[PDB]
Design a protein around this ligand. Structure first.
Ligand SMILES: *[C@@H]1O[C@H](CO)[C@@H](O)[C@H](O)[C@H]1NC(C)=O
Ligand SMILES: *[C@@H]1O[C@H](CO)[C@@H](O)[C@H](O)[C@H]1NC(C)=O
Ligand SMILES: *[C@@H]1O[C@H](CO)[C@@H](O)[C@H](O)[C@H]1NC(C)=O
Ligand SMILES: *[C@@H]1O[C@H](CO)[C@@H](O)[C@H](O)[C@H]1NC(C)=O
Ligand SMILES: *[C@@H]1O[C@H](CO)[C@@H](O)[C@H](O)[C@H]1NC(C)=O
Ligand SMILES: *[C@@H]1O[C@H](CO)[C@@H](O)[C@H](O)[C@H]1NC(C)=O
Ligand SMILES: *[C@@H]1O[C@H](CO)[C@@H](O)[C@H](O)[C@H]1NC(C)=O
Ligand SMILES: *[C@@H]1O[C@H](CO)[C@@H](O)[C@H](O)[C@H]1NC(C)=O
Ligand SMILES: *[C@@H]1O[C@H](CO)[C@@H](O)[C@H](O)[C@H]1NC(C)=O
Length: 549
């Protein structure tokens, strides 16, 4: 018969497909269609590797502008595309990757490179044995002959990226049981009525769904759980109205905002905001009243966000907490595509972030973030914590691997660990005025450990002490290479700041740096400025920065 895709649905492997898959690299795909990579084909086989059957795994594709060329002006202007595929597994599986048909056998680099997965090359195909892990893996497959140079960085990256998201099977907490009378499973196509449903659980089963570029998934206050099934692709953005103790979004399906123009404003008919009112539609939005609320985000893949990926409403933002895992953000070519907000008590792990702005927002206390892979694009620091003075304490960011960076200039506020200026007086985050700080607030007990930057990289840190700093320690951080010196992006700095009202000097205390390597050079105090390129530490703080071995 006519060739058909064959997907896996067993206790060891699960892959899916979309019959309305559309190969398109220039315009918006049809409503009921899903942009599919015409360059990469993926099949997965549960080990042991035998002449047995290999199952197809749909390869998604996100492109800058989302086919809207009059939208490219809001991207960094590169011609890079991002393809990806996800699958669930419970046992070691071999991933077979194929291309065009005129493609020669090219070498591939897996990122993070720490994975060290077995890689075989056979007849214009790449065989990657992916080991099973209760936390799955998120990695980039980069074909040498597909690498290009991004100006002015010169960063060598894939023109056509391919991401693989191998996740563990879903449990009773992340996958609703079918047939519950208190849940509603909207059929494929335009989705309507979820904003007034009496259901408490929205279930999107395999299939394509879409709100428009002029409407999003507002869930009734009654809704506390949104599930995107593996094989489900939903075009829209979600907003809970519920103020219950917990609201949840799970499943390994896709939530794509490809239909919204950049900075789409719900209050202005989803049109580009009138004047940067910071009302660009978020992919994850919620609201809390007087009671605390936990936001659970699990397994979902968010693509093409039209603005900041997430933000909650309220005056009691410290009453919110997050629990996210096995979550991904791909195809975020638009600017200001911030990663999630991590409210007090948050625990985030095994996340993949493709972002053109503030990545890890360290704005709240008692936060734990680990096992993150970041494909930072061209703006904002990897880690941000400097738009507004605040009291923040007890933060741990461990095992973070920035696989790529493509900064252009200083105005991009580059750097791994950054803290831009006070947005109230320097909205763009850059200004010589360092006298708008608050000597009454302090950020303390901060630990950034096991950070890693592959390829060329920006400065280790560019921190503006807008409030006091105390007990901040960097442990094990390696920068494979620095970006071109001429672009003003590799030197770290930390200028003395002053209180806005009192004029009192902002203090920095116990800022330690341990295990900092640049290439094959282990940095130390007598190495700081030489290789480490740490030149900007203000003499007033020099005594507070310690290079311990
Ligand atoms: C197999 O996977 C499909 C989606 O690809 C899912 O809808 C279905 O429930 C699975 N079959 C079962 C019940 O094992
Ligand atoms: C994409 O941009 C790269 C440089 O960033 C360039 O080398 C490549 O030719 C471009 N794609 C094409 C084939 O137009
Ligand atoms: C519910 O959503 C629809 C879809 O756009 C919208 O037209 C309607 O005004 C909304 N009703 C509510 C709950 O305000
Ligand atoms: C952080 O945790 C500590 C102790 O667990 C607690 O005293 C403090 O209030 C917390 N801060 C916030 C903003 O939740
Ligand atoms: C400091 O932060 C760490 C996070 O690694 C936490 O385990 C510890 O309890 C905090 N200690 C203080 C000062 O409460
Ligand atoms: C910025 O610094 C200047 C000192 O040069 C100070 O007078 C001003 O109040 C600060 N912030 C602003 C622009 O309000
Ligand atoms: C710091 O606290 C003092 C005393 O309450 C106050 O006068 C001053 O304005 C505060 N500084 C800032 C940055 O608000
Ligand atoms: C720092 O790196 C060393 C070498 O791999 C490792 O043994 C140690 O546990 C790391 N420390 C932290 C902060 O995890
Ligand atoms: C980079 O910085 C140097 C010194 O700070 C400056 O002279 C140069 O103009 C900057 N390059 C540009 C234009 O980005």
């Amino acid at each position: 018969r006519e060739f058909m895709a064959v997907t896996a649905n067993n206790s060891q492997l699960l892959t899916w497909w979309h019959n309305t898959g559309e190969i398109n690299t220039q315009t918006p795909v049809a409503d009921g269609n899903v942009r599919q990579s015409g360059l990469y084909s993926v099949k997965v086989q549960t080990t042991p590797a035998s002449s047995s059957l290999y199952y197809d795994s749909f390869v998604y594709l996100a492109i800058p502008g989302n086919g809207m060329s009059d939208q490219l002006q809001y991207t960094q202007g590169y011609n890079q595309t991002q393809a990806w595929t996800s699958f669930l597994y419970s046992h070691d599986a071999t991933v077979k990757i194929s291309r065009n048909g005129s493609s020669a056998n090219s070498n591939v680099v897996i990122r993070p490179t720490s994975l060290n997965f077995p890689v075989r090359y056979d007849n214009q195909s790449v065989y990657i044995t992916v080991p099973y892990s209760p936390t799955g893996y998120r990695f980039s497959v980069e074909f040498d002959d597909d690498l290009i140079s991004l100006a002015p960085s010169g960063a060598r990256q894939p023109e056509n990226a391919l991401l693989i998201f191998a996740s563990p099977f879903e449990n009773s907490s992340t996958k609703p049981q079918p047939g519950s009378p208190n849940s509603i499973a909207p059929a494929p196509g335009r989705v309507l009525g979820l904003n007034t449903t009496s259901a408490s659980t929205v279930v999107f089963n395999p299939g394509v769904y879409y709100f428009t570029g002029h409407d999003h998934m507002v869930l009734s206050s009654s809704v506390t759980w949104v599930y995107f099934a593996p094989g489900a692709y939903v075009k829209g953005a979600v907003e809970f109205l519920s103020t219950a103790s917990e609201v949840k979004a799970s499943g390994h399906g896709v939530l794509s905002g490809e239909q919204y123009v950049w900075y789409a404003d719900p209050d202005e008919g989803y049109q580009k905001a009138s004047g940067a009112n910071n009302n660009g539609l978020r992919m994850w939005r919620g609201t809390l009243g007087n009671s605390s609320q936990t936001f659970v985000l699990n397994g979902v893949t968010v693509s093409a966000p039209p603005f900041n990926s997430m933000d909650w409403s309220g005056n009691s933002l410290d009453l919110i907490t997050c629990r996210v895992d096995d979550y991904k953000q791909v195809g975020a070519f638009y600017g200001q595509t911030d990663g999630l907000e991590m409210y007090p008590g948050t625990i985030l792990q095994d996340v993949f972030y493709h972002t053109d702005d503030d990545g890890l927002k360290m704005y709240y206390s008692n936060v734990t973030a680990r096992n993150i892979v970041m494909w930072k694009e061209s703006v904002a620091p990897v880690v941000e914590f400097g738009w507004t003075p605040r009291n923040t304490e007890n933060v741990l960011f461990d095992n973070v691997d920035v696989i790529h960076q493509a900064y252009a200039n200083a105005g991009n506020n580059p750097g791994i660990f950054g803290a831009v200026n006070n947005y109230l007086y320097a909205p763009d985050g850059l200004s010589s005025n360092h006298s708008t700080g608050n000597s009454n607030m302090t950020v303390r007990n901060i630990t950034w450990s096991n950070f890693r930057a592959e390829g060329s990289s920006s400065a280790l840190f560019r921190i503006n002490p807008i409030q006091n700093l105390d007990n901040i320690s960097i442990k094990n951080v390696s920068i494979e290479s620095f970006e071109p010196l001429s672009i003003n992006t590799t030197e770290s700095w930390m200028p003395v700041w002053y209180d806005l009202n009192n004029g009192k000097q902002i203090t920095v205390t116990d800022f330690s740096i341990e295990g900092f390597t640049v290439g094959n050079t282990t940095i130390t105090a007598s190495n700081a400025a030489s290789v480490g390129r740490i030149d900007g530490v203000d003499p007033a703080y020099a005594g507070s920065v310690h290079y311990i071995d």
